[PDB]
Design a protein around this nucleic acid. Structure first.
Ligand SMILES: [K+]
Ligand SMILES: [Mg+2]
Ligand SMILES: [Mg+2]
Ligand SMILES: [Mg+2]
Ligand SMILES: [Mg+2]
Ligand SMILES: [Mg+2]
Ligand SMILES: [Mg+2]
Ligand SMILES: [Mg+2]
Ligand SMILES: [Mg+2]
Ligand SMILES: [Mg+2]
Ligand SMILES: [Mg+2]
Ligand SMILES: [Mg+2]
Ligand SMILES: [Mg+2]
Ligand SMILES: [Mg+2]
Ligand SMILES: [Mg+2]
Ligand SMILES: [Mg+2]
Ligand SMILES: [Mg+2]
Ligand SMILES: [Mg+2]
Ligand SMILES: [Mg+2]
Ligand SMILES: [Mg+2]
Ligand SMILES: [Mg+2]
Ligand SMILES: [Mg+2]
Ligand SMILES: [Mg+2]
Ligand SMILES: [Mg+2]
Ligand SMILES: [Mg+2]
Ligand SMILES: [Mg+2]
Ligand SMILES: [Mg+2]
Ligand SMILES: [Mg+2]
Ligand SMILES: [Mg+2]
Ligand SMILES: [Mg+2]
Ligand SMILES: [Mg+2]
Ligand SMILES: [Mg+2]
Ligand SMILES: [Mg+2]
Ligand SMILES: [Mg+2]
Ligand SMILES: [Mg+2]
Ligand SMILES: [Mg+2]
Ligand SMILES: [Mg+2]
Ligand SMILES: [Mg+2]
Ligand SMILES: [Mg+2]
Ligand SMILES: [Mg+2]
Ligand SMILES: [Mg+2]
Ligand SMILES: [Mg+2]
Ligand SMILES: [Mg+2]
Ligand SMILES: [Mg+2]
Ligand SMILES: [Mg+2]
Ligand SMILES: [Mg+2]
Ligand SMILES: [Mg+2]
Ligand SMILES: [Mg+2]
Ligand SMILES: [Mg+2]
Ligand SMILES: [Mg+2]
Ligand SMILES: [Mg+2]
Ligand SMILES: [Mg+2]
Ligand SMILES: [Mg+2]
Ligand SMILES: [Mg+2]
Ligand SMILES: [Mg+2]
Ligand SMILES: [Mg+2]
Ligand SMILES: [Mg+2]
Ligand SMILES: [Mg+2]
Ligand SMILES: [Mg+2]
Ligand SMILES: [Mg+2]
Ligand SMILES: [Mg+2]
Ligand SMILES: [Mg+2]
Ligand SMILES: [Mg+2]
Ligand SMILES: [Mg+2]
Ligand SMILES: [Mg+2]
Ligand SMILES: [Mg+2]
Ligand SMILES: [Mg+2]
Ligand SMILES: [Mg+2]
Ligand SMILES: [Mg+2]
Ligand SMILES: [Mg+2]
Ligand SMILES: [Mg+2]
Ligand SMILES: [Mg+2]
Ligand SMILES: [Mg+2]
Ligand SMILES: [Mg+2]
Ligand SMILES: [Mg+2]
Ligand SMILES: [Mg+2]
Ligand SMILES: [Mg+2]
Ligand SMILES: [Mg+2]
Ligand SMILES: [Mg+2]
Ligand SMILES: [Mg+2]
Ligand SMILES: [Mg+2]
Ligand SMILES: [Mg+2]
Ligand SMILES: [Mg+2]
Ligand SMILES: [Mg+2]
Ligand SMILES: [Mg+2]
Ligand SMILES: [Mg+2]
Ligand SMILES: [Mg+2]
Ligand SMILES: [Mg+2]
Ligand SMILES: [Mg+2]
Ligand SMILES: [Mg+2]
Ligand SMILES: [Mg+2]
Ligand SMILES: [Mg+2]
Ligand SMILES: [Mg+2]
Ligand SMILES: [Mg+2]
Ligand SMILES: [Mg+2]
Ligand SMILES: [Mg+2]
Ligand SMILES: [Mg+2]
Ligand SMILES: [Mg+2]
Ligand SMILES: [Mg+2]
Ligand SMILES: [Mg+2]
Ligand SMILES: [Mg+2]
Ligand SMILES: [Mg+2]
Ligand SMILES: [Mg+2]
Ligand SMILES: [Mg+2]
Ligand SMILES: [Mg+2]
Ligand SMILES: [Mg+2]
Ligand SMILES: [Mg+2]
Ligand SMILES: [Mg+2]
Ligand SMILES: [Mg+2]
Ligand SMILES: [Mg+2]
Ligand SMILES: [Mg+2]
Ligand SMILES: [Mg+2]
Lengths: 116, 75, 92, 56, 136
RNA sequence: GUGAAGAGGGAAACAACCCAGACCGCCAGCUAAGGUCCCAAAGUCAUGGUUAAGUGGGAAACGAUGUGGGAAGGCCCAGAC
RNA sequence: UCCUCCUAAAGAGUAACGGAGGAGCACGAAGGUUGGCUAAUCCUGGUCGGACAUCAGGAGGUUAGUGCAAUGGCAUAAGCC
RNA sequence: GCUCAACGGAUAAAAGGUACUCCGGGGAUAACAGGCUGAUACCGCCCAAGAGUUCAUAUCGACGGCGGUGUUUGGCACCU
RNA sequence: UGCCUGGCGGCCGUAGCGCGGUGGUCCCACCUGACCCCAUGCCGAACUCAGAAGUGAAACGCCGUAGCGCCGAUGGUAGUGUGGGGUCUCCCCAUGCGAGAGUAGGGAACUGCCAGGCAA
């Protein structure tokens, strides 16, 4: 199984991050689509969430699953996050190597204004 | 005889118990491995010593997938 | 295969030994949706009853407060060395 | 409602807990009729040293 | 003479032989020799009582030995003072609480199974009794 | 826990056991542990049993139709031993 | 002298010429930290290749590993690159 | 910069003999005997695989068991 | 509102296995290509990137079935604090605490918060 190997590869970050009690930006990548959501320090309730699965963002782009699409979500999440009052967060890469789409998402989240 | 040696005793155990008020820095458990684990506002030093990181009352819990004992503090 | 038996009121170590040193011994009846029933009964009867192989197979009707309850012996505790019973579990 | 307690044995070859419990009841010597306010606690103390006290 | 083939530790503490036994029911064979008394059976006693049964019932029948020693007993040599180490393991014993079935027989008559167990019981230190495999 | 450093009463005599902690006096009373036929204070008390061994008043494996108290089995006036 | 286990009577501590074992160092990476990994023993199949090198699969689920004894620990791995 | 490892390290630096012995002490501690214990010892007994011309118990008894004595070799260190 | 599936927590086995059936419009997974970003101590199996031809085969979900695992009374039993008694290397009364194992059975989990599609 791959999934299980990705979960336990992520777990160390998650468990270290919930101990600090910080608001984490989870980013679940997929062959088709890229997701992102800001979750409260308790871990249960979600404050902000955005993805290429949302038609509001899907209608605009060429294809839902690439660097330019990840930047569009990375902009979107951070654009909502500032309206809610969120600013200082952390970035949970969620078992995905910080390199391509998630790096584009993070860089777009930084460049949008979300200071982390 | 052939044997008759022994080490000095290490005074390991739960120093502060559940429900006990402790000050920031107070050692809660001296022990070898992580028989107890660090929860909320509790540290875990090089000796695996669990110590209070904030002033409050000690709380023992049994939580996790593998069902381990955690020590937390709540103010 | 019909035995009269009384309902227990005191139950524990202290009561059961007082009872067991008075030619009687504790048993219990349980089964179905109904609650369990703790049942004091005489030793010298049930000791002679168990010699037959039918006792640990066939249905017994235990008489309690008038009412005859149908049961089978599910489990039984022998005394360690002396030839005598300590306790019987009657499934309904 | 008060309960009259009486010490009916010596407190000589007794455990420190039992020597304490009689000090907690206020019993000093054998044949000392002390009356105390009936609570769950005092009945616990009387229960602890029941062998050497008598209740009225 | 029965003895454990290899052990973790050579010498064991004395301990205390308290409580009731656990192998009370006659499990394998038809009949059995139950220990009424309390004590400890040496390796020699077991073999001695086994030989007395085996030879009474002849080639016919089958015997079980429910007890096994696995407890080494030390003993200090003659004219040796106290201390200067724990003594040397001489013999091996099985601790026997009341209720313990020691031996069990099978494939013999009831009248001739008893006569065999008397001869065994004569070898043992502990007070014993005859027991039959009942149901439940 | 006691003695040590605690006297008194009992355990025949007996620091360490049981009872109980002596401030002094009294030819008063109630008790504890032990007891209550005589030595020796107090029941030759009452009641219902059990022991024939001086058991009680030293000792085990085993050995015995000693002798109570139960609970079952045998199997018979076609008279069972 | 020092460390580990029991003795040690479920806090700590606890003796004997009690029962069993170790230490008097190692390491510039065997430390730090970021990124990845996941183990023994099998059973199969496979050039020499055997009871056992390497490869491929399965079954296993930490039965391993941890610089050194033992105990407590380690999968978020403190194990392995 | 110390196996000051007798590891809270007496000195920087130290082994023996004494039946030629001596003083202070000790029944805090041995040898003698007493005591407690009874492993051992000795003395009994229980079970009966075996002897017997066969036929356990005339007579002895394997394997095992249980006592008694204080009684040897002891243990302990309570008296001196 | 329900039906779905993702993400993320609570709960940690009544929550896990084996077993049988199923899902593919989306969703998800395998998948398709590797000039590139980046990757193997060899290998696009991983990790990564670009995509949408197929598929639901395996995975993952999901519903079923007690073959296992697990949960688990009541009564008893064992221990045992206190105080007493024995025939005292063991036990027994009085009084409180009371297992473990094993039965009768329960059991194919239960829910939070967003987020998308589908009968309303
Ligand atoms: K001490
Ligand atoms: Mg890591
Ligand atoms: Mg949409
Ligand atoms: Mg020592
Ligand atoms: Mg130690
Ligand atoms: Mg020590
Ligand atoms: Mg020291
Ligand atoms: Mg540190
Ligand atoms: Mg007094
Ligand atoms: Mg006393
Ligand atoms: Mg006074
Ligand atoms: Mg006075
Ligand atoms: Mg012990
Ligand atoms: Mg046992
Ligand atoms: Mg059992
Ligand atoms: Mg020596
Ligand atoms: Mg005294
Ligand atoms: Mg003095
Ligand atoms: Mg006195
Ligand atoms: Mg006196
Ligand atoms: Mg006397
Ligand atoms: Mg007298
Ligand atoms: Mg006197
Ligand atoms: Mg005295
Ligand atoms: Mg007394
Ligand atoms: Mg006084
Ligand atoms: Mg006075
Ligand atoms: Mg009077
Ligand atoms: Mg009176
Ligand atoms: Mg009395
Ligand atoms: Mg009296
Ligand atoms: Mg008189
Ligand atoms: Mg008189
Ligand atoms: Mg008269
Ligand atoms: Mg008269
Ligand atoms: Mg009279
Ligand atoms: Mg009379
Ligand atoms: Mg009479
Ligand atoms: Mg008479
Ligand atoms: Mg006499
Ligand atoms: Mg006598
Ligand atoms: Mg006879
Ligand atoms: Mg007669
Ligand atoms: Mg008579
Ligand atoms: Mg009777
Ligand atoms: Mg301990
Ligand atoms: Mg301890
Ligand atoms: Mg303790
Ligand atoms: Mg000491
Ligand atoms: Mg050494
Ligand atoms: Mg070094
Ligand atoms: Mg390196
Ligand atoms: Mg590190
Ligand atoms: Mg498999
Ligand atoms: Mg290991
Ligand atoms: Mg090891
Ligand atoms: Mg490391
Ligand atoms: Mg590691
Ligand atoms: Mg110098
Ligand atoms: Mg030296
Ligand atoms: Mg020194
Ligand atoms: Mg020193
Ligand atoms: Mg020191
Ligand atoms: Mg010195
Ligand atoms: Mg010096
Ligand atoms: Mg020098
Ligand atoms: Mg000399
Ligand atoms: Mg000389
Ligand atoms: Mg001279
Ligand atoms: Mg001199
Ligand atoms: Mg002199
Ligand atoms: Mg002396
Ligand atoms: Mg000395
Ligand atoms: Mg001599
Ligand atoms: Mg002497
Ligand atoms: Mg004597
Ligand atoms: Mg003797
Ligand atoms: Mg012999
Ligand atoms: Mg013997
Ligand atoms: Mg002699
Ligand atoms: Mg002698
Ligand atoms: Mg000495
Ligand atoms: Mg001494
Ligand atoms: Mg003298
Ligand atoms: Mg599931
Ligand atoms: Mg399936
Ligand atoms: Mg299948
Ligand atoms: Mg299909
Ligand atoms: Mg199918
Ligand atoms: Mg679509
Ligand atoms: Mg491919
Ligand atoms: Mg791929
Ligand atoms: Mg499928
Ligand atoms: Mg298939
Ligand atoms: Mg459902
Ligand atoms: Mg069902
Ligand atoms: Mg079924
Ligand atoms: Mg069913
Ligand atoms: Mg209930
Ligand atoms: Mg007591
Ligand atoms: Mg007691
Ligand atoms: Mg009493
Ligand atoms: Mg008495
Ligand atoms: Mg006595
Ligand atoms: Mg219960
Ligand atoms: Mg239970
Ligand atoms: Mg259970
Ligand atoms: Mg069942
Ligand atoms: Mg069922
Ligand atoms: Mg479900
Ligand atoms: Mg539901
Ligand atoms: Mg809601």
């Amino acid at each position: 199984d791959k999934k299980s190997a990705r979960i336990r590869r992520a777990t160390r970050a998650r468990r270290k991050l919930q101990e600090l009690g910080a608001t984490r930006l989870v980013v679940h990548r997929t062959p088709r689509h890229i997701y992102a959501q800001v979750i409260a320090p308790n871990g249960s309730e979600v404050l902000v969430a955005a993805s290429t699965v949302e038609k509001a963002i899907a209608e605009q782009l060429k294809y839902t699953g690439n660097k330019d699409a990840a930047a569009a979500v990375g902009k979107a999440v951070a654009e909502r996050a500032l309206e809610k009052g969120i600013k200082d967060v952390s970035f949970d890469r969620s078992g995905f190597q910080y390199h391509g789409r998630v790096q584009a998402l993070a860089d777009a989240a930084r460049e949008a204004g979300l200071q982390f | 005889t052939r044997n008759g040696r022994d080490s000095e005793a290490k005074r390991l155990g739960v120093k502060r118990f559940g429900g006990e008020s402790v000050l920031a820095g107070s050692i809660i458990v001296r022990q070898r491995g992580t028989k107890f684990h660090a929860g909320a506002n509790v540290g875990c030093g090089r000796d695996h010593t669990l110590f209070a990181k904030a002033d409050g009352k000690v709380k023992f819990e049994v939580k996790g997938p593998k069902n381990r004992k955690f020590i937390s503090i709540e103010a | 295969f019909t035995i009269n038996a009384e309902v227990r009121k005191e139950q524990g170590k202290g009561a059961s030994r007082r009872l067991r040193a008075a030619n009687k011994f504790p048993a219990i009846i349980y089964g179905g949706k109904e609650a369990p029933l703790a049942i004091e009964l005489d030793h010298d009867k049930v000791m002679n009853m168990q010699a037959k192989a039918e006792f640990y197979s066939e249905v017994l009707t235990i008489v309690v407060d008038g009412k005859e309850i149908k049961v089978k012996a599910q489990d039984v505790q022998r005394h360690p060395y002396k030839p005598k019973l300590q306790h019987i579990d009657f499934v309904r | 409602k008060t309960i009259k307690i009486t010490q009916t044995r010596s407190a000589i070859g007794r455990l420190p807990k039992h020597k304490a419990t009689l000090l907690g009841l206020g019993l000093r010597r054998i044949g000392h009729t002390v009356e105390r306010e009936d609570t769950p606690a005092i009945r616990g103390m009387i229960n602890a040293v029941s062998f050497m006290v008598k209740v009225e | 003479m029965l003895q454990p083939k290899r052990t973790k530790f050579r010498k064991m503490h004395k301990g205390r032989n308290r409580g009731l036994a656990q192998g009370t029911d006659v499990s394998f064979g038809s009949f059995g020799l139950k220990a009424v008394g309390r004590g400890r059976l040496t390796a020699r006693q077991i073999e001695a009582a086994r030989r007395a049964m085996t030879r009474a019932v002849k080639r016919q029948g089958k015997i079980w030995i429910r007890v096994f020693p696995d407890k080494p007993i030390t003993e200090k040599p003659l004219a040796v003072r106290m201390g200067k180490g724990k003594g040397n393991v001489e013999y091996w014993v099985a601790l026997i609480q009341p209720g313990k079935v020691l031996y069990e027989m099978d494939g013999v008559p009831e009248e001739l199974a008893r006569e065999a167990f008397k001869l065994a019981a004569a070898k043992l230190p502990i007070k014993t009794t005859f027991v039959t495999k009942t149901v439940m």
